[model samples]
Target chain A: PPADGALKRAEELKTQANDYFKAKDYENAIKFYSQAIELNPSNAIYYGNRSLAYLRTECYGYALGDATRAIELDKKYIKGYYRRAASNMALGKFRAALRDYETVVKVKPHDKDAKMKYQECNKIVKQKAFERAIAGDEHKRSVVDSLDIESMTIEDEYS
Target chain B: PPADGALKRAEELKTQANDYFKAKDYENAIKFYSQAIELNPSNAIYYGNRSLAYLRTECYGYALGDATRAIELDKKYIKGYYRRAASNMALGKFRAALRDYETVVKVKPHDKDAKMKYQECNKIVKQKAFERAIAGDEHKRSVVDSLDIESMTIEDEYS
Candidate 1:
């Protein structure tokens, strides 16, 4: 039991998370995913999945943190970058999200979702910079707080 | 050993629609469904078929309209009600969607998807009501523009 206790427990937790998530029981899914992360922090997927749960729960800050942790665990974690980008967009952190989305598109060019998000973020970043340049110091700091990430769709959460 | 391709040609558009649905080619799916509907508008299934394409494309308003048309053509159409409920939920008409879902469950009592969707809708309705009561519509809406529903998770997509 000791040899793979954490691994087995983590796997079981993920299984529970998937079932609950599918059943629309996001609270349980989040609980189980957090347990899995605690049991086995080595798995990047666990963190990535927990980030999705956070995103679904509307905890953009937590989602960003977990996604960042997932990327740290595995530099090539595509989903990690995607989650982070989505959360970053929510928080009006368009520059960070743009970079993350660009990486996602680079790794999976055919990923239409990533590609589209990259474009949206590109526009946000460009628009913000342009507005900032014209407005000088006073308006430069206001653009980030006024980004139009509202009415945002939650259709991006896929594992 | 080839079956007569001529016999299948009459239903070629339906087959093409199915292929597009499976391939996640919703634009093509909508195209073929429209073609099939033009070939035979009497068939309620054609409208139901088109509604699915609209659903995937996040054209919830269009999907709702098609589902209504399908049900008008054939009142007994179970899938029409199912799709209508889904589109209604997308449009935030949870109460109306719940009724449709309940009717669906009554029609096909053992249908797992219908049953689960009904329950999920009820839960969302209750939670949202609670949220709104606690904090009115004046509460700040979060910034998380939804991702492309066309490529959203299978859990959300019925098909």
Candidate 2:
């Protein structure tokens, strides 16, 4: 144990968290992960693990935040980037997903799993960019047409 | 001007509908558009406009139905394809969106907006295929490990 037996306590809590995660008790898993974080705040893996629990619970925003924190704490935490990439795709935050997954694939080039997921994330990003471009009036008309209909008005009241 | 005056009435209603659309009153717009559609059931534009109104009201499935109906009535109706593509995108029915947008792009090859939208849809189709592959276990053992982790939860007292 490092300073005050923190690592031992954190490890025990993390194991318990993993157990809870297996049981599909994501709430308890998140609770234990938070406790582990409290004991040993420096561990990127704990944050990334908590993010996975958040992801399983369908709390994409929570997962994204924790994964990002883990990445910030340890720039080389590949798992952190992977979880955030997954969360970003689900949340329609495709740009960051592309960035995260691309990095994950680059970091683990030999890992087929990472490469495939990164490829999937890349396609999602391209689709999202299309939606954005359409909304921005990436149009045939020189000027953004007024909803593409010339000001047609009969009366203010339907009657 | 035919003595029945149906076209004239429909035009009036369509104009009023556009006015309501400009007023950001999609409910009233849909009402007037419905009246226009009833007066002149053969016009693809009316259905396309109604689909847009439904989209604004967050009636994505209804919008999709109307868009499809519009396309059926007039396969050459680009607006029909556009709104249908939009509805499909909203409903996460990317395959249909890809199909519709692809047709639109082909119909007007020089149209930048259509081309970009179609390209985006193409990206979506590619991503979806990749996801389906993963779901169907294209990588076998890799995904199975994650699936096992997903379902192998604790049989705890939380129940």
Candidate 3:
């Protein structure tokens, strides 16, 4: 239900966003991209641009949300999957990130970055679990040592 | 100076390298890519692929070296700058990374990824210098703390 002039306005805003993005002014880029999205809510490229700008500003939650919206708008937007995966990884949602990366691999069989990030995220998740297990074991050992010492009452019988 | 047979062999090895890279087996990818490079040393695409594999394996030194060679072989290979920038960033050579990223932006003016990565590299280089300054201040504080005991001892002797 868009107006006749909506698409043209959206295109202009998108171009403005690109110029701001190229200037490294991500804040302004995001503003213009958001304005473009308002004019054409189903536009995936505008959402993608805003998502990347959010990522530049370390707004992981907003980046993930916008990237998800982009993917919803256009299932074939591979950059949406990549941006969402990276934001998910930054937020420690490793499984979600992996799923997005897997999608990328399926969509673009030659995407090396997707394959590499998928493997790297899997390895990091496993490594973190292993580290937590080691830490738990060390804590249990320390507690057991304290209990053993406490139970060894050397006061009454020896005296 | 590669023979036709050598070029064919290089093509075969390049295919193998691509297969391994797609499978996320960077070690084997690098090996096959090296074979391709040996067979036809002037193929910039082969060097770019091998450099990306090296980057995947965290072999920043080798990746940067191969990227440099790729640029030398074919100055028009934009992928060379991309790979070199990534490798330099991994090696903490942020200035070098920024330079390569700038080259990428210049060569591919409409490439969104290249422009974003150039901005990112520039930001990283600035942040790295800031972090170094912070670390220097922390080191100075530690040295001051280490000298405290000696100063106290000298004061006691004078008293």
Candidate 2 per-residue C-alpha lDDT over B16-42 given as tens digits, one digit per residue, 9 for 90 to 100: 888889888888999998998888887
Residues A1-159, model 2: lDDT tens digits: 256688888888888998888777889999999998998888888888888888787787898899899989999877788778767666656576778777877778899987877776576556544544443333212221212322322223332
For residues A27-132, could you state the per-residue lDDT of candidate 1 as single tens digits?
9988988887787877788787777877777788998999899889999867788888877777767788888888888888897977787887787667655544
Candidate 1's TM-score reads 0.42
Once superposed on the true structure, which residue ranges of model 3 sit more than 4 Å away at CA? A1-4, A149-159, B1-159
Model 1: lDDT of residue B82? 77
lDDT tens string, model 3, B1-159?
Answer: 688999999999899989999999997898899789778978999989988887787656457667877888999888888888887677556787788888778877998988788888788878887998899999999998778564454445543
Q: Report the TM-score measured on chain A for model 2.
A: 0.77
Pairs that clash in candidate 3: none
Ordered list by lDDT, greatest first: 3, 2, 1
TM-score of 2: 0.43
Task: Estimate, for each residue in B21-73, the C-alpha lDDT of model 1 and write its tens digit.
Answer: 77778899888878766666666777887787787777879989998999999
Task: Give the distance in Å from residue B80's predicted Cα in candidate 2 to where it truly belongs.
Answer: 30
Q: After TM-score superposition, what is the CA distance of residue A23 in candidate 2 from its true location, in Å?
A: 0.9
Q: Which stretches of candidate 2 lie above 4 Å from their native place?
A: A1-4, A129-159, B1-159
